[PDB]
Symmetry: D2
Subunit: 236 residues, 4 copies
């Protein structure tokens, strides 16, 4: 079970594993360890997988349930991870991006850390769901500080509309800087696992009207907490 490093700050490929429900404990711990470290992990050659096999494999890692986003951040208890499989890919394009929000934080100048540590964003959906998340959250498992932003961010608490947009785009520019991202060229039998609590992702609509079907199993999450132990606030 080798783990190939793809990029300096994000992405790893994992060889010598056949994803499925009947897997070894020691194997799973290598996967989680690689997931937490590299934020998104990839599995080639997984042509054995159907839905039920992918769902059973997800059950080991946790509890099963365009533009840059963390999935469902308008909700308070937003997903921990996702297992995504290709079933039907187009003849060209259809690649996907991931960004490491843990490394994003780490590389912030200390002034911007000061800012973000104490900053809170209003996440919403465009049935109206509203959550105030901290822009910085501590990762339950790794204890890493990770920026929490993305396209569900409506505004920052306290700041006016102009300041919100401007500061928002400042963070996203760092979060999605090419060095801090990985772009995956999907082939059949590929499976990506990403930590939704330390990443943003983005689909790319570069395959025209071609069909592109994927199968996604999303693991259960938990309410974020900032560096002062403050958890997220609900409204709607």
């Amino acid at each position: 079970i080798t783990v190939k490093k793809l990029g300096s700050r994000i992405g790893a490929q994992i060889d010598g594993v056949r994803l499925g429900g009947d897997l070894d404990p020691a194997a799973v711990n290598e996967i989680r360890a690689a997931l937490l470290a590299h934020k998104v992990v990839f599995f080639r050659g997984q042509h054995q997988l159907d839905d039920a096999e992918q769902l059973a494999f997800a059950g080991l890692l946790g509890t099963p349930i365009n533009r840059w986003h963390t999935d469902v951040t308008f909700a308070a208890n937003y997903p921990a991870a996702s297992v995504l499989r290709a079933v039907s890919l187009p003849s060209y394009g259809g690649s996907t991006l991931w960004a490491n929000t843990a490394a994003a934080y780490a590389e912030l100048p200390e002034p911007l850390k000061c800012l973000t540590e104490n900053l809170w964003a209003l996440h919403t959906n465009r049935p109206d769901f509203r959550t105030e998340h901290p822009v910085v959250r501590v990762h339950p498992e790794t204890g890493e500080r990770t920026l929490l932003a993305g396209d569900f961010v409506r505004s920052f608490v306290g700041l006016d509309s102009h300041e919100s947009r401007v500061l928002f785009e400042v963070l996203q520019r760092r979060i999605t800087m090419p060095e801090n991202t990985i772009r995956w060229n999907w082939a059949p039998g590929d499976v990506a696992i990403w930590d939704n609590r330390a990443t943003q992702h983005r689909a790319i609509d570069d395959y025209d009207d071609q069909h592109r079907l994927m199968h996604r199993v999303t693991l259960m999450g938990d309410v974020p907490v900032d560096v002062y132990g403050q958890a997220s606030r609900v409204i709607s």
Copy 2:
């Protein structure tokens, strides 16, 4: 001596005082108190003041030496205050703007305080002066925090070009909010005194190609210190 507020966050007009080199200590203590409190103070009908009589008066406040700026912040020990007198005005226009950078800091959300308190800016003169000032200085006399920025800020330390211009303009917008500024319509024999340690100012070129003349006496200042007690840093040049 009576002092009248002009706006809620800045400006005061002081009557009952003829400015000159020979003034009562108690009176100059009331002027300074008003200057520190209101950041800019205006004197009507000071027709007796010529260059020499102005220079004298300024010497009771300290030691004698268009875009929103704080005067000469590309130097480490930039001036504390200035006395500006009108002599030849235009027939219309030619007002001047002042911004209270102390009230600006106070109005900030806590997130932007965190930022500004720890943010440091490189001020330059496009002689090659270069100075790393804090974005927040503690005022030597009032102890108030004041935002230190303006048109001499080339960049912020640790941030790139884009982040800099972005945050620069975010700060300047809050500083130059109309409610945090005052526009002075110059009449002849008007004298303005402003605290350069707690303000920005801007001249308005709305008098076409008419002649304009003012007389400025600028006072010696000290090196700023951040909220932790760290001084500004001379990269190039020498103190004033």
Copy 3:
């Protein structure tokens, strides 16, 4: 009747006129001419005016009915001008800002004219009025081109959120530039008249929470037309009546 510039781009003071319904028709022509030329005009020491006499004077100019805005641009036929009179001023502060959107357009570099001439904007009251105005309207009387924007602007047609807000701030920066504005220190008896088809205005809340009250009389305006001659489009809400 004298009319005095208060600035190169905007503002003028008019003295030598007792305002009221019994005004000399030739004097009204000079008022109107000044208003169109200088965008906002001020009268000092008009202590004789009241609600009734102001409304009467207004009727000679046209038909009667904080942050930078043109008045009620969320409607299609937004006012042509307004007459504003002080009744009760605070002891300090309370000054008001005007910006010249005609001068603003004139100063635009050619590329930015290309953009603005061809740019439309959705205005809204944040009742549910929603209107697509041109960012440049041709002025009925003067024939001048004026930038039409302000705080009611929600977005620009054909452009996404980021682009819209970015370009919006580009224009507002030019409009509200100090050179292109005037700030009025209100005294009792002061009256201000401005052309709402060629200006934005902004109240300044720099008087804490002291008591302030003005009285305003607003005139009827027409629907803006772009340089090509296309008129503003109503999406929701009725035009202004009376």
Copy 4:
């Protein structure tokens, strides 16, 4: 001899051709067509190349001489295309991005076309040259956005506006749907049309070594839609 589409707006892979001076002109015409259509073209498994044989193939196209840029736009007669080859790659990362500035222009809302057609940018290195923001491509006749990180300012606009409009343009240009990210493998060769693209290196390999051999071709002076050519300030 086949050419495969990599993404809707940009990117092509050309398989079944050995690059070098020893190539049928008929193949060169099929390669040039792809380069003009797809803006960047990729050759897998070109293990048998070297500095001499890359240069010979570059001559068949024309006349031989990190952040989002078009190469050497501070110059006026800046390059037409480049042939880049991997000689020694890091163990991980080292990818490169290309953006299609022709597709960028086409996607613009009509108001932004008004602007960009009439807009001019001062390009510089930290030489100086005033280029049109929209150039007409000499071969294809397509209108392409011309910007990148050599742009200091736009002619007639102040610093703030220039800066703020610049990011509006670059944001569209570098929109993922308009780009391609290439994972470099041994013996890979890319040719890109520098007149219709931007490119960006990705420094995501810590302190590792990515040696690349580039061969750049001669390119003519840009012209705007009105026919006005670029003005040189500092030659």
